[model samples]
Target: ATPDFPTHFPKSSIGIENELAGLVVAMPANSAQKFGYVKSAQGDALFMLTKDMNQGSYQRPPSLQDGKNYQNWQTHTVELVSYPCEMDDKAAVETRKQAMLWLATHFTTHIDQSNHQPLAPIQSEDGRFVIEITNAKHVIAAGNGISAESQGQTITMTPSGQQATVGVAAKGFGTSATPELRLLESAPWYQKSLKSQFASLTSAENLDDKELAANVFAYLTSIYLKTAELAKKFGIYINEWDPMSEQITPNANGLTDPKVKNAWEILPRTKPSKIVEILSKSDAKAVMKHIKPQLQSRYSESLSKNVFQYFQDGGEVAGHGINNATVGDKHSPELAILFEFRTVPNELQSYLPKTE
Candidate 1:
C-alpha cells in the first residue's frame, strides 16, 4: 500500500510552499577554504579570513533582475567564530543528518501534483487549511493579487509597484528544481536561529576542527529539534533563540549562558495546559521552591526585574496570572521558566530545579 501523506505539518504561514527552499539558499555554501582556529601567544584564537580564503559565492536567481532599479551591486563579507568541542566523525555525520531531517520535517510541505491547478486552492495534509496559488504565471504568489513572470526555467516575482523583487526560483510544481521561494516580510524566530546556528558551525574557529564544529552543530541542532517537539506536544513556541538577547546590560552584545537563555526563551511560549500538568506532577512544589532564590537573584539583576516581584508575591508575572489562570488562558512565563529549568540537563537542573 502507498504510504499516507503527513498531516501534522503546519500550512505555510507565508504563501510559498516548502519554505525550506529560502532557508537553504540563505545558508552558507560549502567551501574548500578552511575556517578554523590557530594557536597564538594568547592561546588558541580564531583564524582571520584573507581575500583568497573567502572564495565562496552565491548566484542570485536570474529572475531577480527582471524589475530592479539598483544601479550597482556590492557584496560584503562577515566572519563568525565558534567555540571548540570534540566529536567523532560518525557522531558528526549523525548530528548533521538529524539537523537536516528536522529542517525537512519542519520547513518543507508536500504538494500533491495530481491535485494542483493554477490559481486554485489546494487542500493541505491537515485538511483544515488550504494553499492557494494566487498567481501561476510566474509560479509565485505575492499577497492576494500579485502574479509572477516565467522565463524559460526561471520565474520572477517582483514586488508590486516596487523596484525590489520578492523571490525567484525554478518552475517546478513541488520540487527543488526551482528552489527560490520568498518568506514573509518578517522572518520567524526559528529561521533566524537556524541561520545563526549555521554561521556558528561554519566559523573559522570551528572549521579548523571538524570534530569540534560537528559537536557544536549537533548540540545546537538538538536544541532546535527539542524546542519544536516541546511546542508540538505542548503547544509552546519560544520566541527567541539568540542567547545574546538575554544579556542584562544594555546592548551588551554578549551571549547568555545557553542553559539560562533556553530556559528564559521557553517560558513565554508555553501553553497553560502544559504548565498545569507540570505543576500537578510529582515534586512540583519542591522544584519551584528550589529555583525561587536563583530566579530572584537573576531576575533582580536583569531587565525583567519588575516581573520578578510577581513570582515572589505569588502574583502574575509578565501579565500571566499563573496562580489563577484557566487552561484557555495565555501561557505564563513563570510556568514556562519552571518547565524549562526542570527539563534541562541534570547537571544544569541544579540552577533551574527539576521535578523529577
Candidate 2:
C-alpha cells in the first residue's frame, strides 16, 4: 500500500508562511536497498544507488524488500549532511547541489565491481607503518611496533609492544575503527557516513517540488503533534492542534521540554519556535493540490479506524491495513516525514515522484 498525502493540514495560529524552500528532509538510511535488482544470468545481485533503478539498464523489476531474491544484495546506506546554516534559500540549494554531486561521485566509485586482489596495502609515506596485502580478501598492516590483520570483514590489531589485541569490526572497512586504531587504521563508519550522506543528498535532489512540499508539511505537522504529545507526558498542556480556531496561545513549556529540546539539537537551526512559525503559515490548500486523491481516501480510512470496535467486531479488513505500525521517534523531522511518505501508496512515494 502507498502512503497518503494529508488532505487537510493543521491550521496555524501565526501568519508566517510555510514556504517549502526552508524545509529540509534527510534521506533515510538503507534507502538504497530499494534500488537493488537481481541479475540471474550474472549469478549475482547488484545494488546501485541512483536516482532511478533503471540506471543499470536491467530489465528485471526493482527489489522492493530486503533478502528477497538477490543472491549478493549490495547494501548502500546514506547519512544526512549538516543542514545549511546561516545560508539563504539560494545559497542553501547550491550547497545541497554541490554536496550531492560530490557524494554521488564518491559513492559510485566506492562500490567497485572489480575483484582486484593482490593489491599492495600502500602505507602513508611517514615511516610510521608497514602494511602487507595478501589478496582482495585480506589486508595486514604493522605500525608503531603493532601489527594488524584484516581478514574477510574482521580486523584484529595486536599491539605486541603493549601486549594487547585490538579487535575491530571491519564491516565498514576504513570507516569503523576503535580509538586505539583511529590513527593506525581507517574507520569504516566514517566512510559509510560519507557514502550515506551522498545517497541522502542525491535522494533530496531527486525530490520534486510537490513531493518536497508534502515532505515538509508532514515533517512540520508531525513535529508539532509529537511535541505536543511529549509535553503532555511532562505534565504540560499545550493546544497545538485545533481545527476550529485561528487564535491559539503558544505554550513555552513544550519548547523547553528536555526531550523536545534534545530533538531540536539534532538538526541545525531547527528550533521549536521556527517549526511553529512554519506550521502557522502552512498552506494546507497548496499541500492538498499536489496530493493525488487516491491518498486522501486511504488516510481517511486509517483515521476512521477504532481499536475498541476492532476487538468487538473481531477486526475489519479494510484500506491499506496498517501499513506502518511504529511511527518514527527519531529527532529529525525530515527522517520522520520520509518514513511517513513510505507508508503511502507505492505510486505516490516521493522517491518515485510523478513525472511531469
Candidate 3:
C-alpha cells in the first residue's frame, strides 16, 4: 500500500549518504543504531527485539545450551555493530525490508557450512558493560582516525575513543573529525512526579464526583505534549477529518486524515450518546464544569454542546460544524468547551509505581 521500492533489490545509496555501502550491509533493519555486544555472565539467551511491531522474532543461539542448566542462556554473546532503522521513515519502511532481505541472505545462506564465526564468550567487566575488540586496528581505521604505533603496538582510535579509556568508532572512512553522540539520561518531570494522581483513579472505594473526574482527566492529559499551541493545532486537525471516508489525506506534515481526501467518501457523524456517556459520568461532569469557562473562551464558544452537534451533523450534509461540548439529553454544540481542561492531580498520580 505504501511506496513500491523493489521486490528484488541490490544495494544503492543516496547522495551524501555516509559510509553507504558498509552501513547498508551492517545496519539492522527497524532497530535503533547503538553498537554493543549482548552478554550475560551465566550464559547467553536468545535475544529478540523488533520495531513498530510489538515483539521481534526469536533468534536461536549458535551454541547449544549448557548441559547441566540450560538456564545459563546469557553467555552466548553477539556484538551488534549497528541498528540501522530508527526514527527515519524512509529507512523504517523501505531500507528495513532490504536490510532484512540482506541479513537473511547472508546469515542463513551458509546454513550447511561452518564458516560462520562462533558466538563470542561473555566476560565480566567490573560492573561496566564493555566489549574489547582485540583487532582494534580495523575499528580505529573505520572510524576515520589517524593510525600510528605507540612504542611497539599500533594505537588506532578516533578522537572520541582516544579521549576516553575506550569508545566505539564509527565504521568506514578514515581520518575525519569525530562526532559525539549523547542521549538524555533522565526521566521527564511529569513521569518523575504524578504517582499520587494514579492512586485516586484506581482506588477500590469510589471517590467523589469531582475527584474521580479530575483524576481521569489528568491521566488522559498526562501522555500528551504540554503545549497550548500544540493542543489547539491538534484540535483543529481532529475537526478537519471526514468521518465517512476511511482514508486520511494529511496536510503538509502528513497529519491530515485520509478518509476525507476522496470527495465521494462520507464522513462518520458523532453520536450524542458518546458525549453524554462521558459528560454525564460523575467524574467527567465534575471535570468539565471545573474547566468550562476556559474551554468556552479558548474554543470561542461553549464546547460541550457544540462539539456534539458538529459530529451529529455529518459534514456531508452540513458544512464544517463548530467545535462545541455540552452535558444534557439533547445534542449540544457547546461540547467543545471540555477540550481545554487540564487533568486533576488524582488522575496524574495513577501512572507511577506504588511505594510501600
Index of the highest-TM-score prediction: 3
* Model 3, span 1-356: residue lDDT tens: 11111111111111110111111111123333222222223322111111111122222233522233222111111222222111123533333223323332332322223222221223333422223222211111111111111122211112111100001111100112222111100112122123244444436635454333443344222222221122234332334333223232323232223322121121112221233333345644544443334334444332323442343343211222222322222333222111100111232122111212
The true-versus-predicted C-alpha distance at residue 258 of model 1, in Å, is 16
Clashes of each: 5, 18, 68
Q: Say which prediction, candidate 2 or candidate 3, comes out ahead on TM-score.
A: 3
Error of 1 at 48 (Å): 44
TM-score of each: 0.23, 0.19, 0.25
Can you give the lDDT of residue 328 in candidate 1? 16
Q: Candidate 2's residue-wise lDDT over 90-172, tens digit each? A: 43333333333332332222222211111233322332222222222211111110112112221111111011011111111
State the displacement of the C-alpha of residue 122, model 2, in Å, after optimal TM-score superposition.
46
User: Clashing residue pairs, candidate 1?
Assistant: 35-204, 36-204, 36-208, 138-148, 170-178
TM-score of 1: 0.23
Off by over 4 Å in 3: 1-25, 28-121, 124-212, 215-228, 231-236, 239-281, 288-293, 300-356
